[PDB]
């Protein structure tokens, strides 16, 4: 009825469990003053040294990079022992994926503002040598009408689509341009209500379609011609010709009005 978690002396009462994974759980919790937080619990007892290293690495980067942008989820505190990790993080409304799934269409202004947030968080991690390499909507949390990156893709291991995967990741079987493609696929989904290769149901074919230059991606004409241009720029198969994040930050789509 009223279970608690302690983290660095501070007791937090669990309001409800909001998420889970392979031995990882996420809780909505309230502190002594009834302030809301998300606590991510990780059980470390089967984790190997390689896995542990990646976990510490992600915690370290999350801790450092949050001072550089408020579009990165706030890590308030954490307790880490040989058995468990508890992370006290800011609480949000809902992740971008869940919100997108129950949204018939997105307001053009909300879409542009979310895009800006996404570019800002991803730009920040890039400025410190991190390429996420696995961006999807689920990696972003909506907090006070603002998108926040909740992770940096460093974690080793604990569904899962290839809809957001870039062609050079598949051919090389990887740079900051790889994240631009995936962000492109998220924006495309926010624009056209599906991702560029969603219609292909065989995953092998889908992978083949992603790397095939004779497979042309559709860009149906829309009122916002700057949005359409951004999509075409992000979804160029050649990474050298693909637009960069700083180029995207100066794009009329994010700048003009």
UniProtKB/Swiss-Prot annotation:
Chain sites annotated for binding ATP: 18-26, 40
Assigned keywords, A-Z: Acetylation, ATP-binding, Kinase, Nucleotide-binding, Phosphoprotein, Serine/threonine-protein kinase, Transferase, Tyrosine-protein kinase
GO cellular component: cytoplasm; kinetochore; membrane; nucleus; spindle
GO-annotated biological processes: chromosome segregation; female meiosis chromosome segregation; meiotic spindle assembly checkpoint signaling; mitotic spindle assembly checkpoint signaling; mitotic spindle organization; positive regulation of cell population proliferation; positive regulation of SMAD protein signal transduction; protein localization to kinetochore
Domain Protein kinase: 12-254
Expression by tissue: Present in rapidly proliferating cell lines.
GO MF, any single term: protein serine kinase activity
Stated consequence of mutating residue 151 to A: Loss of kinase activity
UniProt-annotated catalytic positions: 134
Keyword Transferase: yes
Family note: Belongs to the protein kinase superfamily. Ser/Thr protein kinase family.
Subunit annotation: Interacts with TPR; the interactions occurs in a microtubule-independent manner. Interacts with MAD1L1 and MAD2L1.
Role of this protein: Involved in mitotic spindle assembly checkpoint signaling, a process that delays anaphase until chromosomes are bioriented on the spindle, and in the repair of incorrect mitotic kinetochore-spindle microtubule attachments. Phosphorylates MAD1L1 to promote the mitotic spindle assembly checkpoint. Phosphorylates CDCA8/Borealin leading to enhanced AURKB activity at the kinetochore. Phosphorylates SKA3 at 'Ser-34' leading to dissociation of the SKA complex from microtubules and destabilization of microtubule-kinetochore attachments. Phosphorylates KNL1, KNTC1 and autophosphorylates.
Protein name per its UniProtKB record: Dual specificity protein kinase TTK
Species name: Homo sapiens (Human)
Shown chain mapped onto the complete sequence: 514 to 794 of 857
């Amino acid at each position: 009825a009223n279970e608690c978690i302690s983290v660095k002396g501070r007791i937090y009462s669990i309001l409800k469990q909001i998420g889970s994974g392979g031995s990882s759980k996420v809780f909505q919790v309230l502190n002594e003053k009834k302030q809301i937080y998300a606590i991510k619990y990780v059980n470390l007892e089967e984790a190997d040294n390689q896995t542990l290293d990646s976990y510490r690495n992600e915690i370290a980067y999350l801790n450092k990079l949050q001072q550089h942008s408020d579009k990165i989820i706030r890590l308030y505190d954490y307790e880490i022992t040989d058995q468990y990790i508890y992370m006290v993080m800011e609480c949000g409304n809902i992740d971008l994926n869940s919100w997108l799934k129950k949204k018939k269409s997105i307001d053009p202004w909300e879409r542009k503002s979310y895009w800006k947030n996404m570019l800002e968080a991803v730009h920040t991690i890039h400025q410190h040598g991190i390429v996420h390499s696995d961006l999807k909507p689920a990696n972003f949390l909506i907090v006070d009408g603002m998108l926040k990156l909740i992770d940096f893709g460093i974690a080793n291991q604990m569904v899962g689509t290839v809809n957001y995967m870039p062609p050079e990741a598949i051919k090389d079987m990887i740079s900051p341009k790889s994240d631009v493609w995936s962000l492109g696929c998220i924006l495309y989904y926010m624009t056209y209500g599906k991702t560029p290769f969603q219609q292909i149901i065989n995953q092998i074919s889908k992978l083949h379609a992603i790397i095939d230059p004779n497979h042309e991606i559709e860009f149906p004409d829309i009122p916002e011609k700057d949005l359409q241009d951004v999509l075409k720029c992000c979804l160029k198969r050649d990474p050298k010709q693909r637009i960069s994040i700083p180029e995207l930050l100066a794009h009329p789509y994010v700048q003009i009005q």
